[PDB]
């Protein structure tokens, strides 16, 4: 009855988004072919939140795959799980976005866009109460970060009282593609702040340092940065997805999340990378987190907290308020009971118990400045703006996603260093 | 005749609607398919029970009672219940989409588009009464449809109805069980708008309820199961005069007179005892004095505050089973020797004493022992004005930020809403501030 | 004494009625007010994104001038 429209954009969004959909089916019990042969009727009450029931038994995932480029979506229908996606919910191009932020949101991109509504109201009518939409792209490409913030604008007219969520991938050197990946997120981001509700900030930097320095890979590829995306990806929506204590929505998600409309924008985190206490301190330590940014460098405005497994609700209560406490600094005091907590009694795949950590910190600020400063580096000399001048934009338009961008950063600070007196 | 309405509004309203009317069949033997053997008027009849029972042909008793939900979800769970043939379809009533903990979206957004089809059953009920006395309203403070459509409701009410009594069981909100942040707004907003609209209201803190479950029941994580159990109790106790007949019976409307002095001081505090074990009341027999006694402990309230910090203006003893006057009235005396029970100098200082024969029911597989007797005091404190206090604090360290408020003004309403709601409170703080205070 | 009776009895019956009225009135005042804000939210939301349309379109536009 609660259902959630799925939309991948670009290489990265696809990629990310095929392995959502692999641990997501393997935890409901589903098979590549589409069929369930689960253990348990948990894993089908709160199915139709993100699979369609078709003819013959089968879930088909409520999912549209979106792309410039044939490439990345023809290794989703190749790979495992690939049958099971609804075949005409594939909408690719051919000329592709390049990486340009510009050919995604406003040339190419834009060519394409009416093709990939058709299929976005095609499921959203078969919806018998529709929450709203979920977004899988990355900000330093050209198509999911292009074409990725211009079907956001686009679904809004369409569904402006529907919520709109983003799991949005940031550009890092230590794993670049390009060089003008600055300038793909700032316009991405100028875009993200006006019409999401609800951001969360896969950075790729915080990635990488996790699987150098905690998993010990030396060189990580992308497969081993998605495992962390896909881990992380099926715990913020465990509480969508299974039957608990708590009973809410995308919506209510947002109420209590988002004290101010443009500061929704959270650091996700996961743990392990074991004891209810171990696995509490290590969810909201800085090396746990998937955006690169040190909590302690800021304060909390808004805290979401999930257990996964058979574990004492009791001793997961103490240890939420052991460490509220023990860290009142870091918790902004002019917001009474920031932190909420939930227990899925069905723990991840290969793990007894586990912790997923949805934090809303104004130390966020820390991952924008970071790229404001690569932005500002390049857009000081004029380098390589003839790649979007040449689509149609001006300087202009770059400056102001560049002074939005700020202004958010100006913001995160603001609550910060406010006080109850 | 003097019939009662019962109306369960929201998660927290349903369910606990589910312990009390579970409760209630126990007490009258009603079986779940809504059949009472005992019963051997068919069709109808004058008795007590039948106050919050209807009776058809086939001799089904009926709840005078409707449940309404912004969402399916947790009337669904009634529909396909153990007490699934108790309910006629028509008095489970239910939305799409919630309020997700807005009360804009409970009062007018999505509220306003099943707010006729509710009134419409409701109206279905009152037809079918001879004599209705008024209406009982389960609902949340802290919830978009417990509190937003709440508020509607009791305004809608009081248009169709005029000044029938309305009577309210409000669940305030406890960060211990509560999963919004929010809850502050949505609470200030609907006390503001219903106040004029409610003619009593017992509050019944989740905190305090979930300390005794802890405490008396030794129950490590009490869930809304615990809860609600033990909150039907209390509700049963406060009803039982409506719907049990006896001699030393007094009416529920006989202690408001006593229990409203003002129309805003109509909240009573409530405080329950026995609230034990089945391993701790095994071959432990407690008394009148013993019971009585515990309903001056504030660890036995529904609302946490200071009663011996503040002054009385009512005193309401509720006795229910093995209870005779006699018991009673030296229990009352021991304590009037011992207690800090300070009263106004503008109202007596005596205990106004009720006594239901029948005795106490448990429901089976719960935690609550099987007493022989047991009490609900029913006082007029000013000390209930600390749960105002405490509320409306968190109300204020927020909106000095207008921290949520966008959630509330995207929904229609405006920021003078929220002003003029909390300007209410701080009036009604100093009512209960004004009472308090000694005469020239 | 016969008049007075009268009268207070009018007196209860035309404050009844009274209460209904201010509460229907309030009520009224209060859906009409919300249907007007929620729509002016909604109107001003679209209208940005109707903005960002004749933007796009100069984009577009701006190109086309190039070649
Ligand atoms: N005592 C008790 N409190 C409850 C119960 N269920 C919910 N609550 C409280 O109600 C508050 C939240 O409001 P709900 O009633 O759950 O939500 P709702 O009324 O359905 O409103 P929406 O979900 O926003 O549409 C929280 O503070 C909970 O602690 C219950 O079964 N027993
Ligand atoms: N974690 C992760 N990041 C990716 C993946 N693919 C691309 N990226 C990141 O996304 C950025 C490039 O975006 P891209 O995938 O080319 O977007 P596109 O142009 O729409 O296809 C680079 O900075 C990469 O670090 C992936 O599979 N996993
Ligand atoms: C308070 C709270 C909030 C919360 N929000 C979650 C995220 C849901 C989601 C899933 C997919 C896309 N966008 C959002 S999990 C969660 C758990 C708690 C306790
Ligand atoms: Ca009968
Ligand atoms: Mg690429
Ligand atoms: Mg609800």
Same mark, same amino acid.
């Given at each position: 009855?609660?259902?959630?429209?799925?939309?991948? @954009?670009?290489?990265?969004?696809?990629?990310?988004?095929?392995?959502?959909?692999?641990?997501?089916?393997?935890?409901?019990?589903?098979?590549?072919?589409?069929? +369930?042969?689960?253990?348990?009727?948990?894993?089908?009450?709160?199915?139709?939140? +993100?699979?369609?029931?078709?003819?013959?038994?089968?879930?088909?995932?409520?999912?549209?795959?979106?792309?410039?480029?044939?490439? *990345?979506?023809?290794?989703?229908?190749?790979?495992?799980?690939?049958?099971?996606?609804?075949?005409?919910?594939?909408?690719?191009?051919?000329?592709?976005?390049?990486?340009?932020?510009?050919?995604?949101?406003?040339?190419?991109?834009?060519?394409?866009?009416?093709?990939?509504?058709?299929?976005?109201?095609?499921?959203?009518?078969?919806?018998?109460?529709?929450?709203?939409?979920?977004?899988?792209?990355?900000?330093?490409?050209?198509?999911?970060?292009?074409?990725?913030?211009?079907?956001?604008?686009?679904?809004?007219?369409? +569904?402006?009282?529907?919520?709109?969520? *983003?799991?949005?991938?940031?550009?890092?050197?230590?794993?670049?593609?390009?060089?003008?990946?600055?300038?793909?997120?700032?316009?991405?981001?100028?875009?993200?702040?006006?019409? *999401?509700?609800?951001?969360?900030?896969?950075?790729?930097?915080?990635?990488?340092?996790?699987?150098?320095?905690?998993?010990?890979?030396?060189?990580?590829?992308?497969?081993?940065?998605?495992?962390?995306?896909?881990?992380?990806?099926?715990?913020?929506?465990?509480?969508?997805?299974?039957?608990?204590?708590?009973?809410?929505?995308?919506?209510?998600?947002?109420?209590?999340?988002?004290?101010?409309?443009?500061?929704?924008?959270?650091?996700?985190?996961? @743990?392990?990378?074991?004891?209810?206490?171990?696995?509490?301190?290590?969810?909201?330590?800085?090396?746990?987190?998937?955006?690169?940014?040190?909590?302690?460098?800021?304060? +909390?405005?808004?805290?979401?907290?999930?257990?996964?497994?058979?574990?004492?609700?009791?001793?997961?209560?103490?240890?939420?308020?052991?460490?509220?406490?023990?860290?009142?600094?870091?918790?902004?005091?002019?917001?009474?009971?920031?932190?909420?907590?939930?227990?899925?009694?069905?723990?991840?795949?290969?793990?007894?118990?586990?912790?997923?950590?949805?934090?809303?910190?104004? @130390?966020?600020?820390?991952?924008?400045?970071?790229?404001?400063?690569?932005?500002?580096?390049?857009?000081?000399?004029?380098?390589?703006?003839?790649?979007?001048?040449?689509?149609?934009?001006?300087?202009?338009?770059?400056?102001?996603?560049?002074?939005?961008?700020?202004?958010?950063?100006?913001?995160?600070?603001?609550?910060?260093?406010?006080?109850?007196? | 005749?003097?019939?009662?309405?019962?109306?369960?509004?929201?998660?927290?309203?349903?369910?606990?609607?589910?312990?009390?009317?579970?409760?209630?069949?126990?007490?009258?033997?009603?079986?779940?398919?809504?059949?009472?053997?005992?019963?051997?008027?068919?069709?109808?009849?004058?008795?007590?029970?039948?106050?919050?029972?209807?009776?058809?042909?086939?001799?089904?008793?009926?709840?005078?009672?409707?449940?309404?939900?912004?969402?399916?979800?947790?009337?669904?769970?009634?529909?396909?219940?153990?007490?699934?043939?108790?309910?006629?379809?028509?008095?489970?009533?239910?939305?799409?989409?919630?309020?997700?903990?807005?009360?804009?979206?409970?009062?007018?957004?999505?509220?306003?588009?099943?707010?006729?089809?509710?009134?419409?059953?409701?109206?279905?009920?009152?037809?079918?009464?001879?004599?209705?006395?008024?209406?009982?309203?389960?609902?949340?403070?802290?919830?978009?449809?417990?509190?937003?459509?709440?508020?509607?409701?009791?305004?809608?009410?009081?248009?169709?109805?005029?000044?029938?009594?309305?009577?309210?069981?409000?669940?305030?909100?406890?960060?211990?069980?509560?999963?919004?942040?929010?809850?502050?707004?949505?609470?200030?907003?609907?006390?503001?708008?219903?106040?004029?609209?409610?003619?009593?209201?017992?509050?019944?803190?989740?905190?305090?309820?979930?300390?005794?479950?802890?405490?008396?029941?030794?129950?490590?994580?009490?869930?809304?199961?615990?809860?609600?159990?033990?909150?039907?109790?209390?509700?049963?106790?406060?009803?039982?005069?409506?719907?049990?007949?006896?001699?030393?019976?007094?009416?529920?409307?006989?202690?408001?007179?006593?229990?409203?002095?003002?129309?805003?001081?109509?909240?009573?505090?409530?405080?329950?005892?026995?609230?034990?074990?089945?391993?701790?009341?095994?071959?432990?027999?407690?008394?009148?004095?013993?019971?009585?006694?515990?309903?001056?402990?504030?660890?036995?309230?529904?609302?946490?505050?200071?009663?011996?910090?503040?002054?009385?203006?009512?005193?309401?003893?509720?006795?229910?089973?093995?209870?005779?006057?006699?018991?009673?009235?030296?229990?009352?005396?021991?304590?009037?020797?011992?207690?800090?029970?300070?009263?106004?100098?503008?109202?007596?200082?005596?205990?106004?004493?009720?006594?239901?024969?029948?005795?106490?029911?448990?429901?089976?597989?719960?935690?609550?022992?099987?007493?022989?007797?047991?009490?609900?005091?029913?006082?007029?404190?000013?000390?209930?004005?600390?749960?105002?206090?405490?509320?409306?604090?968190?109300?204020?360290?927020?909106?000095?930020?207008?921290?949520?408020?966008?959630?509330?003004?995207?929904?229609?309403?405006?920021?003078?809403?929220?002003?003029?709601?909390?300007?209410?409170?701080?009036?009604?703080?100093?009512?209960?501030?004004?009472?308090?205070?000694?005469?020239? | 004494?016969?008049?007075?009776?009268?009268?207070?009895?009018?007196?209860?019956?035309?404050?009844?009625?009274?209460?209904?009225?201010?509460?229907?009135?309030?009520?009224?005042?209060?859906?009409?007010?919300?249907?007007?804000?929620?729509?002016?939210?909604?109107?001003?939301?679209?209208?940005?994104?109707?903005?960002?349309?004749?933007?796009?379109?100069?984009?577009?536009?701006?190109?086309?001038?190039?070649?």
């Amino acid at each position: 009855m609660r259902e959630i429209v799925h939309i991948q @954009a670009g290489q990265c969004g696809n990629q990310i988004g095929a392995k959502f959909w692999e641990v997501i089916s393997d935890e409901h019990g589903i098979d590549p072919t589409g069929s +369930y042969h689960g253990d348990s009727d948990l894993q089908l009450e709160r199915i139709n939140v +993100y699979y369609n029931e078709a003819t013959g038994n089968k879930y088909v995932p409520r999912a549209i795959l979106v792309d410039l480029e044939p490439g *990345t979506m023809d290794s989703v229908r190749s790979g495992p799980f690939g049958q099971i996606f609804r075949p005409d919910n594939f909408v690719f191009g051919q000329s592709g976005a390049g990486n340009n932020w510009a050919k995604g949101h406003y040339t190419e991109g834009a060519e394409l866009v009416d093709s990939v509504l058709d299929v976005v109201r095609k499921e959203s009518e078969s919806c018998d109460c529709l929450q709203g939409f979920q977004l899988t792209h990355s900000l330093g490409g050209g198509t999911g970060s292009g074409m990725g913030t211009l079907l956001i604008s686009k679904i809004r007219e369409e +569904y402006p009282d529907r919520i709109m969520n *983003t799991f949005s991938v940031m550009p890092s050197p230590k794993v670049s593609d390009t060089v003008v990946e600055p300038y793909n997120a700032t316009l991405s981001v100028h875009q993200l702040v006006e019409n *999401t509700d609800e951001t969360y900030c896969i950075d790729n930097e915080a990635l990488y340092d996790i699987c150098f320095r905690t998993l010990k890979l030396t060189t990580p590829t992308y497969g081993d940065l998605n495992h962390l995306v896909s881990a992380t990806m099926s715990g913020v929506t465990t509480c969508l997805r299974f039957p608990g204590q708590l009973n809410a929505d995308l919506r209510k998600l947002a109420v209590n999340m988002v004290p101010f409309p443009r500061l929704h924008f959270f650091m996700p985190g996961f @743990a392990p990378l074991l004891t209810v206490p171990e696995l509490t301190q290590q969810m909201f330590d800085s090396k746990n987190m998937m955006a690169a940014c040190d909590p302690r460098h800021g304060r +909390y405005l808004t805290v979401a907290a999930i257990f996964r497994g058979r574990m004492s609700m009791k001793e997961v209560d103490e240890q939420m308020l052991n460490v509220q406490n023990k860290n009142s600094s870091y918790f902004v005091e002019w917001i009474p009971n920031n932190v909420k907590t939930a227990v899925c009694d069905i723990p991840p795949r290969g793990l007894k118990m586990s912790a997923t950590f949805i934090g809303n910190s104004t @130390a966020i600020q820390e991952l924008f400045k970071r790229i404001s400063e690569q932005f500002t580096a390049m857009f000081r000399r004029k380098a390589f703006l003839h790649w979007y001048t040449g689509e149609g934009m001006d300087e202009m338009e770059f400056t102001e996603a560049e002074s939005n961008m700020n202004d958010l950063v100006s913001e995160y600070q603001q609550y910060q260093d406010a006080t109850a007196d | 005749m003097r019939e009662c309405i019962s109306i369960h509004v929201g998660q927290a309203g349903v369910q606990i609607g589910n312990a009390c009317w579970e409760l209630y069949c126990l007490e009258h033997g009603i079986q779940p398919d809504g059949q009472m053997p005992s019963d051997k008027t068919i069709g109808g009849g004058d008795d007590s029970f039948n106050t919050f029972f209807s009776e058809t042909g086939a001799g089904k008793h009926v709840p005078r009672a409707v449940f309404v939900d912004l969402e399916p979800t947790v009337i669904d769970e009634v529909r396909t219940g153990t007490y699934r043939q108790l309910f006629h379809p028509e008095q489970l009533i239910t939305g799409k989409e919630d309020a997700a903990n807005n009360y804009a979206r409970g009062h007018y957004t999505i509220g306003k588009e099943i707010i006729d089809l509710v009134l419409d059953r409701i109206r279905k009920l009152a037809d079918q009464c001879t004599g209705l006395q008024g209406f009982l309203v389960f609902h949340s403070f802290g919830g978009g449809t417990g509190s937003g459509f709440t508020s509607l409701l009791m305004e809608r009410l009081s248009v169709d109805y005029g000044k029938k009594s309305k009577l309210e069981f409000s669940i305030y909100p406890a960060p211990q069980v509560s999963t919004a942040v929010v809850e502050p707004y949505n609470s200030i907003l609907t006390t503001h708008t219903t106040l004029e609209h409610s003619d009593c209201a017992f509050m019944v803190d989740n905190e305090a309820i979930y300390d005794i479950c802890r405490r008396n029941l030794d129950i490590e994580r009490p869930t809304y199961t615990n809860l609600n159990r033990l909150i039907s109790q209390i509700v049963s106790s406060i009803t039982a005069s409506l719907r049990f007949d006896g001699a030393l019976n007094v009416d529920l409307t006989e202690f408001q007179t006593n229990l409203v002095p003002y129309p805003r001081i109509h909240f009573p505090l409530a405080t329950y005892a026995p609230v034990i074990s089945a391993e701790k009341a095994y071959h432990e027999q407690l008394s009148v004095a013993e019971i009585t006694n515990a309903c001056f402990e504030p660890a036995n309230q529904m609302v946490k505050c200071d009663p011996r910090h503040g002054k009385y203006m009512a005193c309401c003893l509720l006795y229910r089973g093995d209870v005779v006057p006699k018991d009673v009235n030296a229990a009352i005396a021991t304590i009037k020797t011992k207690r800090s029970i300070q009263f106004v100098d503008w109202c007596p200082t005596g205990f106004k004493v009720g006594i239901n024969y029948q005795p106490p029911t448990v429901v089976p597989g719960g935690d609550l022992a099987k007493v022989q007797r047991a009490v609900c005091m029913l006082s007029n404190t000013t000390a209930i004005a600390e749960a105002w206090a405490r509320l409306d604090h968190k109300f204020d360290l927020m909106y000095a930020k207008r921290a949520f408020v966008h959630w509330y003004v995207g929904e229609g309403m405006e920021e003078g809403e929220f002003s003029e709601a909390r300007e209410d409170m701080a009036a009604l703080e100093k009512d209960y501030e004004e009472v308090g205070v000694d005469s020239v | 004494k016969r008049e007075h009776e009268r009268e207070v009895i009018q007196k209860a019956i035309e404050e009844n009625n009274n209460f209904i009225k201010m509460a229907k009135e309030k009520l009224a005042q209060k859906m009409e007010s919300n249907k007007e804000n929620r729509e002016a939210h909604l109107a001003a939301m679209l209208e940005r994104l109707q903005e960002k349309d004749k933007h796009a379109e100069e984009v577009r536009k701006n190109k086309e001038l190039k070649e």
